UniProtKB/Swiss-Prot annotation:
The modification Phosphoserine is found at residue 62. This is Serine/arginine (SR)-type shuttling mRNA binding protein NPL3. Belongs to the RRM GAR family. Residues 5-75 form the RRM domain. Present with 78700 molecules/cell in log phase SD medium. The chain holds residues 121 to 197 of 414 of the full protein. It is found in: Cytoplasm; Nucleus; Cytoplasm, Stress granule. The lineage of its organism: Eukaryota, Fungi, Dikarya, Ascomycota, Saccharomycotina. It comes from Saccharomyces cerevisiae (strain ATCC 204508 / S288c) (Baker's yeast). Involved in mRNA processing and export. Required for efficient splicing of a large set of pre-mRNAs by efficient co-transcriptional recruitment of the splicing machinery. Remains associated with the mRNP during early steps of translation elongation. Methylated by HMT1. The methylation is required for nuclear export. Signal peptide: none annotated. Interacts with RRP6.
Amino acid sequence: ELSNTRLFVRPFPLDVQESELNEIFGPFGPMKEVKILNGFAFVEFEEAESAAKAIEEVHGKSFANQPLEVVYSKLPA
């Protein structure tokens, strides 16, 4: 066990929103939470299959200027 379901998506500046995450994460299906901060997104699902595919779709791929950490994000809240 970890957070099992959270996409730690921080390459972008203030430009990222739930609409840009809708462009990237909408292909997976789920996107149950979409916490937006000052250059950071902490997307979330209620199960580990959207996480497994989110990882294989875009973890470590270079978005905007640097790679993603679409994973079991290191935050419990």
